[model samples]
Target: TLDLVNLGVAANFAILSKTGITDVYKSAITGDVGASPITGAAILLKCDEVTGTIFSVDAAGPACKITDASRLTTAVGDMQIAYDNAAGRLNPDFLNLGAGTIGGKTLTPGLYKWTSTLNIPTDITISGSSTDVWIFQVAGNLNMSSAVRITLAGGAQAKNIFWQTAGAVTLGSTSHFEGNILSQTGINMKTAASINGRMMAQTAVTLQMNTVTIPQ
Candidate 1:
């Protein structure tokens, strides 16, 4: 069995990717960011404005672009390990919900599964205690509409929520999201969007002007 004790520790990173990380004008990341098994792409980061440390597989490969390139290799490797752990979880608490469409719905702590695409066209709520955990398994794309909000009540913590996607994941403009996102493909965060959790993508991560903070 995967060590649950080490799970939280490994998922603590704010952003991680296997291929590359692309950021647009003035995006602020309040935690460590890294890309591994690859190097040149991480150089795309505009270090002048980022608040966190940056890393790539190659140390001394680029200037301040990678503040701590040495850590990139390990961080990226652990990332995929966490992704695998989340995806391998069995016996979901809920399955095939709302035909894969969840909008204006109030969800509680549980393991949820969707065999098709998952869409949130409107505001949604995920409520639970800080100790409670939620894991969402999505087989296809995960899309959040513009201005949509994900509310967490009752002492909920974004760190305890996990989203494992087999396809791409997109967050629309100005939308606010929570929880860690583990994507098999890519993650696209549109303009003004914000996230309170980590973005761990296997392929690439594209972020526009936005704010990303690793939840406490």
Candidate 2:
């Protein structure tokens, strides 16, 4: 999360792709979605059920589909800044736990650093309050297995959690995830997967009938 209140950047977006976004089926997105650097021609968003606006960069400049071009351009920059800010957070409460396999573990609010890849083989529970924050710094890829879930408790909010990955991120089929994902590379959400936060990828974002919602 960008801590928008402190940075003075609005946290109203759910998906931001640097390259482009491709949807396999009808996806229901509940927040603003956009792609920068890459033009609207590269974005293949097939859904007609986005609750917010949509934007992209074209040959001239910011060419939005359902929002103002100028506004979307600013939002694109802010989204990129958010990614950098989250990834650069130094220090962590936990470092390299289970050598990057964080399955079957109950995690609290804190900064977690993983030197290598991360894989969730089972359900992971997060126990915290709505005000608590969690920042995950993964130096490599992140993989969540099929049907695996990230359940929240004690008033935890998805907006307060962040996953900063240095490599690609893959959410398995039917997996349930939470929090914002800032990936250095691409993000792939398999069939029927669901997320309660944002997916901001440095490269592309591929989705397959997924449900993406921005946390309030």
Candidate 3:
């Protein structure tokens, strides 16, 4: 029971952490009924630090878990992607998508069916040619060359790049790119590479050998 600071009134009650005596005191002062109430009870929080705990039998089939190539053919692409998702692994490779757009359309990030080989032009800027800067998102992997540089057309306030995919994005061994990736997948940064935008991948994000900044 707490006596009023100035008032002579006293709360003649028992304060129990589980019974929310704390909440009553806090609310009388702050005017906020918090959503999370402290309960004096046993709680269990757990994390799986072991790889063996992962359910592998769920996708029990002949899966091409690993391979040695970058370019994915249409027929091979479908199988590789499927296996990659189930196996939770990827074979690294260099990507060279020559500079061009598809049917004069500015692509929005998603599971796009890439007809032309993906390209991060030596001067590729995923933004506007004139007025409105593009807000580009990625729903899959983007493998750019070591000579590529990704940046926003407008200044830092433009907020252009977003990686909304559930796939692992990899930067070439010496490439540089800038973007914000949502929490759902992992992004791998290679040697001597640099990333400007913030990164928030759901899984573990590893910087092999590079510089990545979490902007304010």
Candidate 4:
């Protein structure tokens, strides 16, 4: 049975990709980052750019990276399990909310589904207790407008927010986001964009002067 425990999209990384990771200039990443089956050279973030473990399959990543294929293999496996569990949830509490244009909305704890694209053109809020959970199933691309942010209220946590996106994910420039994004495709974080969670993609994660941190 798929309960919260089985659906633990839980990962120790701020970023994890299947294909590879690309970086722009200096990025302030504050959690574990890795990729499996790919050369550690494919994991681009510099040692000084991150404050957590940099898992690689080879010795070619950053100067201070750890070559731990076993750890990444397991973490990436669990990521897929969590993605499917979130996508497999039935009876969504919200269907096509705001036609997937959830800007300036206050979302509570529940399961939300969108067969269309999700756009955050403005600021939004995800409010709940620390123990509460929120899952968003997006079948299309997720586009967040630049300079906008996601405000978490009432002790809402980024670790408790699950975003299962079937298409590409674009976090706008200078925008602040909170949640764990599981993308079926790629994820692009524009310049200066920040995330208080993780981005686990099946493909690549293109980064440009971003800040990604795992929630405490």
Candidate 5:
């Protein structure tokens, strides 16, 4: 079994960004969304749009926002450390499969490393047991085409899947993705794109009418 990358305090967040968070109206986020070292004005989600806590630094965010500057700083610190832990793992079980064009592949539990960008134009499957783990280490941007899906088969748990990327991570329109996204830059979720995991970014998290459901 692969050693899981411990997320520490960052594990409690569903959407966590460093600089700010941009959201279109009516985006449904089901977990905690927090921003650090930035004013609450930078987090643009509406009060009713998020189903959970909205953490901001000041009183500039939504009326329901929580002013948790110290809490956010701790979580952000753990987020960066978790990114390093995921990217620094060695001995990848799969290396650059499909040259980063892995749209229709069914993946198993393992450590996958990519040196460049990853493009998914079609549906892909991640099949494994409930307890199994899969970690994807990406060195470049990850782009998923519109209407695509990252399907989970067998008993795979989205919480056990980790996507660690050094570049931007974009999920296309109406697409579905699963896993804990540890992005070095930004995480842009296109219109109606949904994720069943966590989105932790070092820069910003841009959302547009998307649905983000935290893993169980």
Candidate 6:
């Protein structure tokens, strides 16, 4: 016989990982979470003093459908979200951070072209370096092969890094990426290598011709 109070029951609904980091928001699509059609439930997020706590929409996914409105009792901390259909929508266009707010740097929550040898400040950390939640939103073309390594920072759970996108994602040759990939277009791994986390793309996911590995 298990004893649980009402508050305990409510708290249980928002199950927090052992690390205490949780994704309060959920996906709009109320269906099985496959490798495609990334929904609110399809992805998860966590925030704290580290790894910038602002909510950004890079490539844009389906709005998060609030199955439990109570989960949003508190303001999502830092984010300007948009809703279109029955759920809260994330814009494909970016909400570039204004000047004086965060060192006058512009960022969108989608795949972005490295552009001109981007330099990450001490505050803005790369993945796998620390035990913080990291997410990458692409803007334009993503040179996966040339893209730097996506480190998986240990957090409340095993999978900490999350990649949400709306454009075509191509895993470059000999490119090793860690973290769950939630994209609108199909995902193709050009090289037959090993990557951490699961792949959930809207379109078909293609692996290299000669890639094989054991389930982690």
After the best TM-score superposition of candidate 1, give how far the Cα of residue 5 lies from its true spot, in angstroms.
8.5
TM-score quality measure for candidate 4 = 0.95
Better of 4 and 5 by TM-score: 5
Tens-place lDDT digits, model 4, residues 92-144: 98999998798889999899999999999999999988888889999999999
Q: Once model 2 is optimally superposed onto the true structure by TM-score, how far is the C-alpha of residue 14 displaced, in angstroms?
A: 1.3
lDDT by residue (29-129, candidate 2, tens digit) is 89877777667766776437577777665443223365345655676677667778877887778899878898999998888899999999999999888
RMSD of 5: 0.8
**Alpha carbon RMSD to native, model 6:** 15.7
- TM-score to true structure, per model: 0.91, 0.90, 0.41, 0.95, 0.98, 0.39
Give the whole-model CA lDDT for all candidates, comma-separated: 0.81, 0.81, 0.33, 0.88, 0.93, 0.32
Worst 10 residues of 3 by lDDT: 7-16
Off by over 4 Å in 3: 1-121, 128-133, 154-158
**Candidate 1 wrongly placed segments (more than 4 Å):** 1-12, 59-62, 66-70
Quote the positional error of residue 110 for candidate 3 in Å.
Answer: 13
Clashes of each: 0, 0, 3, 0, 0, 21
Query: Per-residue error at 5 for model 2, in Å?
Result: 9.0
| Per-residue C-alpha lDDT of model 1 across residues 85-192, encoded as one tens digit per residue | 878888887888988889999889888888899999999999888788888899999999999999999998887888999999999999999988989999999999
Q: Which residue runs of candidate 6 sit more than 4 Å off their true CA positions?
A: 1-131, 146-148, 152-158, 209-216
lDDT value, residue 193 of candidate 4: 98
